[PDB]
Design a protein around this nucleic acid. Structure first.
Ligand code: HPA
Ligand code: HPA
Lengths: 340, 340
DNA sequence: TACGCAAACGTTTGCGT
DNA sequence: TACGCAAACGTTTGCGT
């Protein structure tokens, strides 16, 4: 049915129907009842399409993600969605896989559907990507995963990935290790280069040099972890500890080690990053830096609703903070006792 | 801008603008150009909201999931979304967590947003849930995870979870085991009771009795797996092999074993179910039954588009098929050599 | 005091000529 | 031959009385 149908069945104006449906003005009880009565028999469902046409807002948010399968991403997504729901919003999920065109498409479809705001999680931000985004400065949006603020027309949440890298390297140091290797994620990403550099700073501070044979690039996918660990323990001289850029990648590293008969951490200590929900059940239970995923979603959604409801103009940035989680994959290194 | 704005800037009727924008009728080149010209300066973005008002379709599909974090679910979701995209559709993701009210809410918001169709993945289907769903028989929909066809007004894709349980138990049998334990998922779910029963049939066939001290209920969450494995290997008499209802749960089982110093599979063979993307990197690499996740999404989306575009009336059902993946978590059991 | 009329949001399309 | 007019989709709201 349409509002007209209900109005006729209730013997009232459509204006009236709309008023009871939205509590936008006082309506006599008996009137209000009859309308409800009508609303029910006809089995009426107001049309958000029509409403949005008038009121100029869809109560829809669009997430332009990289992928949603990856544990990391998946945890954030579910976080963002929880908040949309409690605040009445509907989520439009779009994965662009780091593909420009795909991005151009989703962006477009999004604007056409008139999303009240946009949450961007694209991992890498090449100029061209930045370009398109700007062409959409009119839609309120927050990038949730870049280093600093890439754009000047968007809100940003900073993860402090660097102080996260440092924390990791420090722990290793403080545990007795000085022969460390690293499997960073894509250098083109914040959680990639960011973590790595935080980590290398700690190293330079300790005068630890990390030989390039010990730095093998990952892609956040287990296979890459698996493969890198292999290249690392396949060398004559091999590290006593390893900083792995992402948990899922580390899970790959564990496997390879186990397959070459190495023991974690008795033979090689491994420390990861993300603290994904299952990291604790890795074998052995993984020690890693925790990315505050939930608050990362809630924070982003909140900066968005702000710009939305309170029509904020100026771009804001909110920092979030990673913290070390000790588990059972790191063991004392050769220099523990000799440490001042 | 609005179409009116572009029309004026192009010195043409809005009808004309709409025709070039939609290639719905021949328009002179020079005309077509000018319109585009206009379309670009004003930076115009057609309004899907307005369009849908007229044409009566939103080109939106709504996924009413249980949760989207869980590896299993997450893999399916990303599958469904890939298909929506290539076919032009937009995805509205809604997690209801098995909460009736939450379900009632999302359903409602969905109908209001006038989704062209609904994809339901609610895990458990209590009567009340069934009730609400029926009240929405008008929206085309397919349940992707039930046993048989729960409703007569919806399409269904059947996973054959039972022949999956059987396959698992058979393998165990054929490997030499006769002392098997099981950690099924929620009995209230298809992938729960279904898998279990497929499995028990195989057992009855071999005259293997599974003592209740050896059946510990899981919930598809690693912790539950962890806890159950513990209760299983904490008994005086303990099984030589274990069928674990879901991979993620099994990952928990592996951990516990490892923690009690047991060896997999030298001490206990473990077989899982789902074949989630990282199962191969479990330690040791997990042997399990593969749920065809991708085709499960694509199949569902396709039955949906059917009812949609081809206005199909009668409810269809398409079966999909699980298949055993051998890895390194199962070892020959005491009766291999004695097997006829 | 409680309610209704008519315009309006941005499009598509019928039926012109 | 190529194009325009006006109605219409389902609502909200201003300004009545
Ligand atoms: O880009 C990423 N992908 C997957 N997991 C991650 N964790 C941090 N960054 C990433
Ligand atoms: O309900 C479920 N939850 C998580 N993983 C699963 N794999 C099969 N069924 C399920």
């Amino acid at each position: 049915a349409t509002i007209k149908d209900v109005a006729k069945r209730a013997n009232v104006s459509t204006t009236t129907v709309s008023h009871v449906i939205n509590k936008t003005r006082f309506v006599a009880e008996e009137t209000r009842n009859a309308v409800w009565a009508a609303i029910k028999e006809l089995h009426y469902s107001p049309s958000a399409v029509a409403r949005s046409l008038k009121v100029n807002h869809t109560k829809s948010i669009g997430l332009l993600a990289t992928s949603s399968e990856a544990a990391y991403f998946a945890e954030i997504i579910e976080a963002v969605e929880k908040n949309c729901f409690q605040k009445g919003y509907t989520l439009i999920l779009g994965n662009a896989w780091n593909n420009l065109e795909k991005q151009r498409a989703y962006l477009s479809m999004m604007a056409q559907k008139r999303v009240d705001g946009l949450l961007v999680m694209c991992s890498e931000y090449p100029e061209p990507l930045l370009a398109m985004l700007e062409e959409y400065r009119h839609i309120p949006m927050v990038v949730m995963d870049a280093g600093e603020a890439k754009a000047d027309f968007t809100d940003a949440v900073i993860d402090n990935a660097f102080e996260g890298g440092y924390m990791a390297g420090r722990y290793l140091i403080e545990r007795g290790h000085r022969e460390i290797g690293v499997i960073p994620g894509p250098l083109e990403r914040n959680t990639g280069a960011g973590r790595l550099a935080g980590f290398m700073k700690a190293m330079e501070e300790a005068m630890i040099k990390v030989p390039e044979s010990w730095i093998v690039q990952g892609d956040f996918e287990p296979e890459s972890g698996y493969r890198a660990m292999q290249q690392i323990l396949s060398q004559p001289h091999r590290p006593t500890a390893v900083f792995c850029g992402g948990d899922i990648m580390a899970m790959g590293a564990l496997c390879a080690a186990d397959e070459m008969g190495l023991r974690v951490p008795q033979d090689v200590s491994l420390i990861g990053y993300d603290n994904v929900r299952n990291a604790r059940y890795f074998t052995p239970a993984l020690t890693t830096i925790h990315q505050p995923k939930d608050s990362l979603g809630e924070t982003a959604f909140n900066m968005l609703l702000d710009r939305i409801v309170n029509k904020r103009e100026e771009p804001q940035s909110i920092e979030v903070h990673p913290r070390l989680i000790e588990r059972r994959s790191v063991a004392d290194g050769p220099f523990r006792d000799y440490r001042r």
